Design an enzyme around this catalytic site. Structure first.
Site, PDB file in Angstrom:
ATOM      1  N   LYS A  13      -6.071  11.695   2.015  1.00  0.00           N
ATOM      2  CA  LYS A  13      -5.359  11.416   3.255  1.00  0.00           C
ATOM      3  C   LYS A  13      -6.284  11.409   4.464  1.00  0.00           C
ATOM      4  O   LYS A  13      -5.879  11.000   5.554  1.00  0.00           O
ATOM      5  CB  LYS A  13      -4.240  12.439   3.457  1.00  0.00           C
ATOM      6  CG  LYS A  13      -3.256  12.486   2.303  1.00  0.00           C
ATOM      7  CD  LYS A  13      -2.527  11.156   2.124  1.00  0.00           C
ATOM      8  CE  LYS A  13      -1.570  11.226   0.946  1.00  0.00           C
ATOM      9  NZ  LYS A  13      -0.725  10.011   0.828  1.00  0.00           N
ATOM     10  N   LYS A  73      -7.593   5.861   7.241  1.00  0.00           N
ATOM     11  CA  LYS A  73      -8.150   5.871   5.890  1.00  0.00           C
ATOM     12  C   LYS A  73      -9.020   4.640   5.672  1.00  0.00           C
ATOM     13  O   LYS A  73     -10.097   4.722   5.078  1.00  0.00           O
ATOM     14  CB  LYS A  73      -7.022   5.890   4.861  1.00  0.00           C
ATOM     15  CG  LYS A  73      -6.140   7.114   4.963  1.00  0.00           C
ATOM     16  CD  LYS A  73      -4.834   6.904   4.231  1.00  0.00           C
ATOM     17  CE  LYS A  73      -3.871   8.032   4.545  1.00  0.00           C
ATOM     18  NZ  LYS A  73      -2.506   7.730   4.068  1.00  0.00           N
ATOM     19  N   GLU A 164      -0.255   0.682  -0.522  1.00  0.00           N
ATOM     20  CA  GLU A 164       0.690  -0.432  -0.546  1.00  0.00           C
ATOM     21  C   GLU A 164       1.250  -0.513   0.869  1.00  0.00           C
ATOM     22  O   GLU A 164       1.914  -1.484   1.238  1.00  0.00           O
ATOM     23  CB  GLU A 164       1.838  -0.178  -1.530  1.00  0.00           C
ATOM     24  CG  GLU A 164       1.689  -0.885  -2.880  1.00  0.00           C
ATOM     25  CD  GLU A 164       2.837  -0.566  -3.823  1.00  0.00           C
ATOM     26  OE1 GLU A 164       3.872  -0.053  -3.345  1.00  0.00           O
ATOM     27  OE2 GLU A 164       2.716  -0.835  -5.039  1.00  0.00           O
TER      28      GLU A 164
END
Ligand SMILES: Cc1cc2nc3c(=O)[nH]c(=O)nc-3n(C[C@H](O)[C@H](O)[C@H](O)COP(=O)(O)O)c2cc1C
Ligand SMILES: Cc1cc2nc3c(=O)[nH]c(=O)nc-3n(C[C@H](O)[C@H](O)[C@H](O)COP(=O)(O)O)c2cc1C
Lengths: 216, 216
Positions: A13, A73, A164
């Site tokens: 994360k 990220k 996603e």
């Protein structure tokens, strides 16, 4: 132990933006993408590997709106891989696969090559003509590649996170994928997690085997 | 060395019907199935692990007609895994996932759990309500599991072969998957290849990086 890798890898994360893959690791992750298996060795894919700041920033553009929680990220990771699937399975591509296998010495006789071509054509046509679902069939092969990749980078001691949560339309436009015959499906930032990655210390959670497995 | 594994693992063409997985290996391949990652940890899957002769025979019913060329692999392997995806994403399942995560200690506050549940529901509805493609979305998660699995067993020193060449309608009916809300996607026999497994010595073949990868 690969099982320990499975029980230890996690979705990162937060990445340490100062830790880059080594030259050898960068070469190794590309090998992983390339050697994933696929139905009839169709390799219906393309990969964008962004490691420069502007390159990652261009990918990060897809983490817009509600997906902003994935922006950091993409920006902080060392290498960001965009997994893409072909939009249509063309004969040109099918011939390329069998011709490459021939060039790689997989056929001892002409009959061996013909049998291989026959089999691939059978599966290709079943999806392109009969079921009219080659787009989905190819995307499934790409996800299989993602699965191979995540365990692989984990076994290499690298961190990553499958994503996603991004706008594929935006990503497709940014890299002109549509015109090239591809479409983005999954984005995978790869690098090293920082102590700030809260998910690095949370226990992994999966439903019980008694629920997901049937033995016979 | 996971890269060597990727360059060495191959689709087994024939299994030694006498070589079985040890009890420990059997537990490990199930661990691989269970711990594969998935979008929002949705785990939209079920696995049939056939290890008995009677069980493998039931799965082999799907290797009919055109697919008879895959029957032997399904019968001779030690363990045969049938990867199944949920046919529709129901709230009941989403509930199970978040409750299990809470039981596993992934949330520090009730608010944290609610937030996680809302987010997963959002993604789920994007596919269920909006795109009306939750069936394809879940199938993709299963293929990712397959990809994770193949590299995993390869790293275990075990042999396997992914199979799309089977009649899923026959397999679904044989195991009453329809009624259970699942559908078969990929069959993966696992075990040890036989001396006759020619594909063990043939060189691997993939298209070049200059074609499949774009660095940015
Ligand atoms: C196809 C796919 C898409 C995912 N989407 C996201 C995402 O957009 N952002 C994020 O932080 N995690 C995302 N996840 C991570 C999942 O939440 C995670 O894999 C799951 O909770 C299991 O935890 P683990 O990866 O640590 O084993 C995705 C995972 C997969 C496999
Ligand atoms: C989803 C999927 C379905 C496949 N179907 C079959 C099959 O039905 N029978 C078979 O013998 N091989 C099958 N293959 C094996 C492929 O032809 C093989 O993975 C590919 O040629 C690359 O070779 P490798 O696995 O040895 O690296 C399948 C592979 C995947 C990944």
């Amino acid at each position: 132990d690969i099982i320990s890798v499975a029980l230890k890898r996690h979705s990162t994360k937060a990445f340490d933006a100062s830790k880059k893959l080594t030259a050898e690791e960068a070469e190794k992750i590309k090998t992983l993408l390339q050697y994933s298996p696929s139905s009839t060795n169709s390799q219906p894919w393309h990969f964008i590997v962004a490691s420069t700041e502007e390159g990652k920033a261009r990918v990060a553009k897809s983490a817009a709106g509600t997906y902003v929680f994935n922006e950091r990220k993409m920006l902080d990771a060392s290498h960001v891989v965009v997994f893409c699937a072909k939009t249509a399975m063309d004969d040109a591509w099918l011939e390329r696969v069998v011709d490459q296998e021939e060039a790689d010495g997989r056929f001892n006789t002409p009959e061996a090559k013909a049998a291989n071509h026959k089999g691939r054509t059978y599966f290709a046509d079943m999806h392109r003509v009969d079921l009219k679902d080659d787009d989905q069939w190819m995307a499934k092969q790409v996800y299989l590649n993602v699965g191979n990749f995540l365990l692989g980078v984990g076994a290499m001691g690298l961190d990553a996170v499958p994503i996603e949560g991004f706008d594929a339309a935006i990503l497709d436009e940014e890299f002109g994928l549509k015109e090239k015959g591809f479409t983005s499906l999954v984005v995978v930032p790869v690098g090293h997690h920082s102590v700030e990655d809260f998910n690095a210390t949370l226990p992994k959670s999966r439903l019980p085997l008694s629920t997901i497995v049937t033995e016979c």
